[PDB]
Amino acid sequence: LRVVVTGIGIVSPLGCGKELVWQRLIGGGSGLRRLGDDIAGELSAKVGGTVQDVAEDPEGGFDPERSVPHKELRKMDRFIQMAMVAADEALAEAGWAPEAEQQRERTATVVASGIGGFPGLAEAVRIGETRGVRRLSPFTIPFFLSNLAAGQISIKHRFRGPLGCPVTACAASVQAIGDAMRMIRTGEADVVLAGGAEAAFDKVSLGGFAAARALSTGFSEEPVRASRPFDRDRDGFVMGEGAAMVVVESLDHALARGARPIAEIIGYGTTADAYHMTAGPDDGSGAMRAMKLALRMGDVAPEQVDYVNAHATSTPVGDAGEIEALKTVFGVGAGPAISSTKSATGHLLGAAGAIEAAFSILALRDGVLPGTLNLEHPDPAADGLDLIGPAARHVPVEIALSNGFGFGGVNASVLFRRYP
Amino acid sequence: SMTLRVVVTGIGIVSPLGCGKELVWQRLIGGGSGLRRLGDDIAGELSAKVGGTVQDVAEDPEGGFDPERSVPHKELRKMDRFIQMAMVAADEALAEAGWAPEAEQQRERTATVVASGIGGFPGLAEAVRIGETRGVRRLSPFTIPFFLSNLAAGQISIKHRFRGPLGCPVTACAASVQAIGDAMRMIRTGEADVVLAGGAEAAFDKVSLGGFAAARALSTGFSEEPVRASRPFDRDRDGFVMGEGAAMVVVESLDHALARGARPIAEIIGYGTTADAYHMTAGPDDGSGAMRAMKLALRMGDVAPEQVDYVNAHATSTPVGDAGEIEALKTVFGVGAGPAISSTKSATGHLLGAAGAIEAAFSILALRDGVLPGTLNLEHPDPAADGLDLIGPAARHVPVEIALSNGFGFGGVNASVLFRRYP
Ligand SMILES: C=C1C[C@@]23C=CC(=O)[C@@](C)(CCC(=O)Nc4c(O)ccc(C(=O)O)c4O)[C@@H]2C[C@@H]1CC3
Ligand SMILES: C=C1C[C@@]23C=CC(=O)[C@@](C)(CCC(=O)Nc4c(O)ccc(C(=O)O)c4O)[C@@H]2C[C@@H]1CC3
């Protein structure tokens, strides 16, 4: 059964609204900024991809009151608020707003997060250390539970089909899209609102990644330079926040209702390294297998892939592993054009898969491949791979692959074809 | 292939009634309870004083929890308690199944799908307290993977070299019902041959308990008589009793099991999942989303309601929750006949994200042995349940062929899984 995407929503460090975000991305913009001392004061990691408010970004700022009434915001952590805005955008684009119970019952909501409501949870613990646990809000638990992103979206829109919340670290929202497609094919839903949401900035979460030496520290005075996937001087990832959503349905379902497919989902693959808890193997074998499964599903040879949106987070070991995986799948000398948009957005963690899927889809729609900012001295291990430098590449393309990996050895890859 | 019959070939349990499914089963069927007074470090400030706790080998010599049996002592520092329980339950299930592939051909066809509701809450809470006292610069390098929900499946995969899909559904108290449904789905789509599926939860902390107490969801009226506090369907229920544990099943096609000589313990014939889109912490009074999930599982199994012998209800002992499920059961099954219904949360407490997997295991064992667990504490059944065959405290010894198990959660999540006895 053929499956398509009919709507996209984005809340990100480059703004809210996918057209504006796309225009900013291709123009070389960056969402990386110095973090507040309340988050980063104790740490050497001083830079993050932050979502700005309307006062800071009048055109593209985040105002969750447009999707959630003021008095309801108290009931949901930031990631959920972001999820609600991104979902509204994707649904409006897809024109999916079912009033009838039949259609509502056939709409699923599958929204990933990596860490979920960390700020809410941290605040509850801090209350426990101060005012006392007898003073916790009645909303404490659903405020931070990961599945209340999907939950609040479903309540608002009356989506009464399956609910999902994959929490598979930084691959989670790639899996959300694969899980959406799988449900369309098994007949368990007719439309899926799928994606990811993450808003985990807090001294403790940042501190936890810091303690693992996973975060960039050497570019604090030049924040836009800090995220440099594939570059010789990369020194760890830059945490980001945001949310991105896609509306997924069968091609036949889309065309019957007059919805324009934006792109087709033709492949999905997911695997486990079973290697180490926080690093993948140097040979990239788990990631390699995930990519090959998505290509097999799409019946696409490696030489037919035009564009790869790599997971590459700007870690030394992580980017090297993905380089090796890509060489195994595609060879050297020819192959796909490859970039990492984490160079501009930072690492949206459990929302990274969905935002990069969205960029992969827009790349196909527009024949514009995002560049990799800061790619000044490519890792020599990547010689023979067509890594896109800072300039976006304007070229008609048909097939795009997007990767997402996470702690716990999770690899996921999703493959798209241009429509028509 | 979508027409594959799917079976369970091994089961593992870590619970408030012990570790090891056979011992746990014998203790459950004998009317045992895992409910105990919590430590003051957890519940000292709160009026919810009772929990289903997992005991160590000093406290329970035959059935105690010793994670060093599964994980070297040095490595325990790297994993929160929910993961340690997951590891022990997974080892049990895998040993019973005889699934320990050494070749990549089989390793690549083994998935690992382990739910949690809250994940490493004690780990996360400790990191935050460290942050307030000693400073975030003192955090362990293992802080993040210590608590991430998916590191339960992750650590299991690493130990056993399972290289197929990893899953971690975090859909609250329906989560490990969905894990089983997701496992079945993956066998039917051809994405895996064997799935280690289940749930793991160890969320006891003053803040998590405090949060549930703030939602008025916890029992507070039975502190002096802990074993009486979890009373699903009873007139005097006043909220659920939090528990901890892990349970796992090994899922594969019947054809694959027969090929390798593994004995199916039961068959998985149906799964359904729905969303209420009603309220963030309560379902509708008529249980209509639960009803729909149950009917979807029955439809998938091609089973009429009158063919169901046993229902392991979600019923957690909350006033509104159990009443909703009563109404859903009446809609699906009618009144006057219908299945025998019990809730084993009466004995184990609510294992949250691991409730689905443990209750699945009990439903499977019920079919295997022809013994339906009772509902402890059911002294004055809610009148709304008149017409439903609620099992009282005594386990019922009767041959049975079909069992349904429900799991629901905050955010309007409903899931149901349906089993048939094997052969
Ligand atoms: C075992 C080691 C060696 C060490 C050395 C160099 C590194 O690059 C890091 C810092 C990160 C590895 C990595 O990219 N993991 C890694 C991964 O497997 C999957 C995903 C991500 C992600 O960001 O999405 C990720 O970050 C590792 C982690 C830990 C300590 C230092
Ligand atoms: C909206 C209300 C009314 C209120 C009144 C009586 C109740 O019984 C509770 C306390 C819990 C309802 C419930 O069982 N939710 C509920 C649910 O939907 C799904 C799962 C569970 C679970 O334990 O697994 C659950 O607990 C609710 C919660 C909140 C405040 C008081």
Author numbering:
A (entry chain A): 3 to 422
B (entry chain B): 0 to 422
Give the published text.
Here we report a functional and structural genomics effort that applied saturation-level transposon mutagenesis and next generation sequencing (Tn-seq) to identify essential genes in B. thailandensis, followed by high-throughput structure determination. We used an “ortholog rescue” approach to maximize structural coverage of these gene families, which are likely to be essential not only in B. thailandensis, but also in related, but more virulent, Burkholderia species, such as B. pseudomallei. Using only seven Burkholderia species to select orthologs of essential genes, we solved structures for 49/406 essential gene families, and for 56 total Burkholderia protein targets (including seven ortholog replicates). Of these 56 targets, 25 satisfied criteria for being a potential antimicrobial drug target.
